[PDB]
Design an enzyme around this catalytic site. Structure first.
Site, PDB file in Angstrom:
ATOM      1  N   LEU A 146      -2.748  11.375  12.241  1.00 23.78           N
ATOM      2  CA  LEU A 146      -2.446   9.994  13.007  1.00 23.78           C
ATOM      3  C   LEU A 146      -1.828  10.234  14.410  1.00 23.78           C
ATOM      4  CD1 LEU A 146      -1.139   8.636   9.780  1.00 23.78           C
ATOM      5  CD2 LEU A 146      -3.225   8.702  10.290  1.00 23.78           C
TER       6      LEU A 146
ATOM      7  N   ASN B 229      -1.501  -0.156  12.626  1.00 27.52           N
ATOM      8  CA  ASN B 229      -2.374  -0.871  13.359  1.00 27.52           C
ATOM      9  C   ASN B 229      -3.990  -0.908  12.714  1.00 27.52           C
ATOM     10  OD1 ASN B 229      -4.162   1.247  14.487  1.00 27.52           O
ATOM     11  ND2 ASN B 229      -2.016   1.817  15.446  1.00 27.52           N
TER      12      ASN B 229
ATOM     13  N   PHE C 121       1.369  10.645   0.951  1.00 26.23           N
ATOM     14  CA  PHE C 121       0.691  10.131   2.498  1.00 26.23           C
ATOM     15  C   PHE C 121       1.819   9.400   3.052  1.00 26.23           C
ATOM     16  CE2 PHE C 121      -2.433   7.524   4.745  1.00 26.23           C
ATOM     17  CZ  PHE C 121      -2.034   8.224   5.917  1.00 26.23           C
TER      18      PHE C 121
ATOM     19  N   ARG D 166       0.989  -1.250  -0.082  1.00 27.56           N
ATOM     20  CA  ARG D 166      -0.051   0.137   0.004  1.00 27.56           C
ATOM     21  C   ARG D 166       0.918   1.283   0.043  1.00 27.56           C
ATOM     22  NH1 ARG D 166      -3.156   2.657   4.323  1.00 27.56           N
ATOM     23  NH2 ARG D 166      -4.949   3.849   3.289  1.00 27.56           N
TER      24      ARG D 166
ATOM     25  N   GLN E 265       3.224   1.712   3.148  1.00 27.47           N
ATOM     26  CA  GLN E 265       2.890   0.586   4.145  1.00 27.47           C
ATOM     27  C   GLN E 265       3.365  -0.741   3.781  1.00 27.47           C
ATOM     28  OE1 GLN E 265      -1.253   0.520   5.232  1.00 27.47           O
ATOM     29  NE2 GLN E 265      -1.026  -1.232   6.314  1.00 27.47           N
TER      30      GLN E 265
ATOM     31  N   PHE F 162       4.456   1.728   8.450  1.00 25.66           N
ATOM     32  CA  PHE F 162       4.386   2.943   7.094  1.00 25.66           C
ATOM     33  C   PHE F 162       5.185   3.722   7.343  1.00 25.66           C
ATOM     34  CE2 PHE F 162       1.709   6.148   9.309  1.00 25.66           C
ATOM     35  CZ  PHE F 162       1.238   5.478  10.290  1.00 25.66           C
TER      36      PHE F 162
ATOM     37  N   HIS G 204      -1.583   6.146  16.183  1.00 23.35           N
ATOM     38  CA  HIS G 204      -0.331   5.326  15.845  1.00 23.35           C
ATOM     39  C   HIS G 204       0.860   5.700  16.233  1.00 23.35           C
ATOM     40  CE1 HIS G 204      -2.699   3.773  12.252  1.00 23.35           C
ATOM     41  NE2 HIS G 204      -3.425   4.892  12.346  1.00 23.35           N
TER      42      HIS G 204
END
Lengths: 164, 6
Positions: free
Chosen positions: A121, A101, A59, A54, A62, A112, A125
């Site tokens: 976040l 998570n 951004f 991902r 991942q 990530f 996270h």
């Protein structure tokens, strides 16, 4: 005293470059150790060979899913998943290594690498590390992850390990 | 199911 691990990135088998990280053990040990321990592959499983399933441009990137490689699997060195050690460190910008998570206290092996400042976040996270060298390597991985996140080409962790 | 949103 802070551990330095790295990822040798390959785009479709052809090597691209190396990217090292600094693990902030001085703040979040268990999270720090799990990534170091899994980056070396000392238990018999880890990042060597896994890909970045991902990647969302601007951004983050991942990866960490060495079992189900589609964002479903992966596991920690403590068995299944683990608790949220703490939330001291924030996503201050590109290079930030944080745990990916599935809600609170669900940290496994997925993580990530931030490719921009993601303060929304913060608190959700656990930030535990940061790209030391090779941030231009993650910048290139970029064009190979769509809006929705599906990669155009396979970004893989060819080789990884601990340098200090 | 692990992962952060944009």
């Amino acid at each position: 005293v802070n551990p330095t691990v790295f990822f040798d990135i390959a785009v479709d088998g052809e090597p691209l470059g190396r990217v090292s990280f600094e693990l902030f053990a001085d703040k979040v040990p268990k999270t720090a150790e799990n990534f170091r321990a899994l980056s070396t592959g000392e238990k018999g499983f880890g990042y060597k060979g896994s890909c970045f399933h991902r990647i969302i441009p601007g951004f983050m990137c991942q990866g960490g899913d060495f079992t189900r490689h589609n964002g479903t699997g992966g596991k920690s060195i403590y068995g299944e998943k683990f608790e949220d050690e703490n939330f001291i460190l924030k996503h201050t910008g590109p290079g930030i290594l944080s745990m990916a998570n599935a809600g609170p206290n669900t940290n496994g092996s997925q993580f990530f690498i931030c490719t921009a400042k993601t303060e929304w976040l913060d608190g959700k996270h656990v930030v535990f590390g940061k790209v030391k060298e090779g941030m231009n390597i993650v910048e290139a991985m970029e064009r190979f992850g769509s809006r929705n996140g599906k990669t155009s080409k396979k970004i893989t962790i060819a080789d990884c390990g601990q340098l200090e | 199911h692990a992962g952060p949103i944009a």
